[PDB]
Design a protein around this ligand. Sequence first.
Ligand SMILES: *[C@@H]1O[C@H](CO[C@@H]2O[C@@H](C)[C@@H](O)[C@@H](O)[C@@H]2O)[C@@H](O[C@@H]2O[C@H](CO)[C@@H](O[C@@H]3O[C@H](CO[C@H]4O[C@H](CO)[C@@H](O)[C@H](O)[C@@H]4O[C@@H]4O[C@H](CO)[C@@H](O)[C@H](O)[C@H]4NC(C)=O)[C@@H](O)[C@H](O[C@H]4O[C@H](CO)[C@@H](O)[C@H](O)[C@@H]4O[C@@H]4O[C@H](CO)[C@@H](O)[C@H](O)[C@H]4NC(C)=O)[C@@H]3O)[C@H](O)[C@H]2NC(C)=O)[C@H](O)[C@H]1NC(C)=O
Ligand SMILES: *[C@@H]1O[C@H](CO[C@@H]2O[C@@H](C)[C@@H](O)[C@@H](O)[C@@H]2O)[C@@H](O[C@@H]2O[C@H](CO)[C@@H](O[C@@H]3O[C@H](CO[C@H]4O[C@H](CO)[C@@H](O)[C@H](O)[C@@H]4O[C@@H]4O[C@H](CO)[C@@H](O)[C@H](O)[C@H]4NC(C)=O)[C@@H](O)[C@H](O[C@H]4O[C@H](CO)[C@@H](O)[C@H](O)[C@@H]4O[C@@H]4O[C@H](CO)[C@@H](O)[C@H](O)[C@H]4NC(C)=O)[C@@H]3O)[C@H](O)[C@H]2NC(C)=O)[C@H](O)[C@H]1NC(C)=O
Lengths: 210, 209
Amino acid sequence: GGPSVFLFPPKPKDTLMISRTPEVTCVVVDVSQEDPEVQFNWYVDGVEVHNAKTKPREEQFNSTYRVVSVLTVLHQDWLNGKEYKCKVSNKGLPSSIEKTISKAKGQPREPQVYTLPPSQEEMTKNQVSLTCLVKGFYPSDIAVEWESNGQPENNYKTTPPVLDSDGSFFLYSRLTVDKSRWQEGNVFSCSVMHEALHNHYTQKSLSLSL
Amino acid sequence: GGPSVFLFPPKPKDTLMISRTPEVTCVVVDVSQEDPEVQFNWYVDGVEVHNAKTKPREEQFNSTYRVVSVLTVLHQDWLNGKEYKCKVSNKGLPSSIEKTISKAKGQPREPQVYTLPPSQEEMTKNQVSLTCLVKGFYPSDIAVEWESNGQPENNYKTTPPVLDSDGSFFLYSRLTVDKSRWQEGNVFSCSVMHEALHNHYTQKSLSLS
Ligand SMILES: *[C@@H]1O[C@H](CO[C@@H]2O[C@@H](C)[C@@H](O)[C@@H](O)[C@@H]2O)[C@@H](O[C@@H]2O[C@H](CO)[C@@H](O[C@@H]3O[C@H](CO[C@H]4O[C@H](CO)[C@@H](O)[C@H](O)[C@@H]4O[C@@H]4O[C@H](CO)[C@@H](O)[C@H](O)[C@H]4NC(C)=O)[C@@H](O)[C@H](O[C@H]4O[C@H](CO)[C@@H](O)[C@H](O)[C@@H]4O[C@@H]4O[C@H](CO)[C@@H](O)[C@H](O)[C@H]4NC(C)=O)[C@@H]3O)[C@H](O)[C@H]2NC(C)=O)[C@H](O)[C@H]1NC(C)=O
Ligand SMILES: *[C@@H]1O[C@H](CO[C@@H]2O[C@@H](C)[C@@H](O)[C@@H](O)[C@@H]2O)[C@@H](O[C@@H]2O[C@H](CO)[C@@H](O[C@@H]3O[C@H](CO[C@H]4O[C@H](CO)[C@@H](O)[C@H](O)[C@@H]4O[C@@H]4O[C@H](CO)[C@@H](O)[C@H](O)[C@H]4NC(C)=O)[C@@H](O)[C@H](O[C@H]4O[C@H](CO)[C@@H](O)[C@H](O)[C@@H]4O[C@@H]4O[C@H](CO)[C@@H](O)[C@H](O)[C@H]4NC(C)=O)[C@@H]3O)[C@H](O)[C@H]2NC(C)=O)[C@H](O)[C@H]1NC(C)=O
């Protein structure tokens, strides 16, 4: 049978701020004990690059090895659609496995970001939900966070992007907060990062209405 | 390589309504032309059963064959956590492939269902979004629909259930409607079917205040 290779894109937030470190990650599993040292060759639009960092093989609990190579990519290259190819081989043997990845193709579209207060029926509860609807975006690569008083909020979860009838994506993020903090008039903000937003970032706030 | 087998659970509405017919479905793909007859054996907690309906093989566009076998299950069996196993083989050959499925284990939890009107900032657009939040439920098997004035409303999309930090699930469903219908005061309703609701059903209405 032999090994399999999986090649993963950078995290959406990492490609949107040049101070962060976006990486493409090439993972080889089902490596055998006696397989020669696994080797990686990396290409960016077909041109070989040499700055990848490959980790020593690690045994998994199913009596196989896993080997990972990580390539730091230029933010602009990823966003401009360059193709990243990982070629996996074993030292001393001719055969290889290649995988390629790139950003999704298609005209990027800007998310529209709306915040929604708790339902009136939820106000009887000890905690309430603040909702951030993000829709109309493309590609589906996106990051959503919440904060209040300049500090990140902990207690939120965000749905995966869902494909809409017009070919763009939507999602919702739900922040749970104590009703007391909402009742006291604290302002909460949903932050969205996406390549089609001005400076790759927007924020919308909400708080209890007058 | 050889064939691949996928085993699918009953549809969520089907297990919650006794008048409905819940089924488990065993699907085999990548069956070659020259492969001997595909055979199914089915078990319920390890005991063989004999009431499955198997369709003849179907040629696919990619020049392979697909075979499907359908087992009708009892509502209570599924909801009580019984394990359904499909064993796929070929007449006269020794090997097999087995797949098992059952309802997720653990204490069921009632969905809380809340409707949310469109954002004021969205109200400048010609169509607006009506949102149904369903949260705190377990297991994740659930159905969500919308209607208005007694008739189904079709222009909605629902997120997959999302695992929350307390071990339950939540999702949102978004119904898109013309601004005018919302402003005329029509009442829309989100309906939710889940095993941990009374009568396995609840609905919450939404309209312009
Ligand atoms: C022996 O064990 C190893 C290691 O497993 C670990 O140890 C064992 C003992 C157990 O304890 C495990 O529980 C434990 O995790 C096994 O290695 C696994 O091998 C399987 C395949 O056999 C790989 O499956 C793939 O998984 C990827 C997604 O992988 C991410 O998500 C996993 C959780 O869901 C997570 O575990 C992974 O590590 C990985 O996590 C990501 O990592 C990156 C990089 O580090 C990181 O940046 C991300 O943030 C992180 N993400 C998350 C969510 O955590 C999945 O994508 C693959 O599915 C594709 O391919 C399938 C074909 O195999 C296909 O059916 C799918 O549909 C999908 O197909 C793709 O679909 C797109 C969309 O249409 C299409 O465009 C593509 O073309 C298409 N691609 C292909 C190829 O078809 C796949 O399911 C595991 O990743 C791997 N685990 C690890 C940790 O490496 C090994 O199998 C065991 N061996 C035996 C013999 O049992
Ligand atoms: C030749 O063609 C056939 C036919 O395909 C059709 O024709 C071609 C030409 C294309 O146009 C296709 O688009 C077209 O559909 C090909 O057959 C396909 O083969 C692939 C495998 O390569 C199968 O993929 C699996 O899909 C299931 C989900 O399948 C449902 O949803 C599909 C839409 O995505 C839909 O097409 C299917 O019909 C099926 O629909 C369900 O049907 C049942 C009853 O029929 C119904 O009750 C459901 O409501 C309905 N659902 C929907 C949404 O409509 C997917 O789940 C599989 O992923 C699992 O396994 C992967 C590999 O093993 C693994 O990597 C994944 O991570 C995942 O793993 C599972 O994860 C869950 C939780 O995450 C866990 O609980 C499980 O334990 C775990 N399982 C395992 C084993 O790990 C998988 O991706 C297609 O279904 C199949 N299509 C059909 C119609 O049967 C064939 O591949 C072609 N051959 C070649 C050589 O190309």
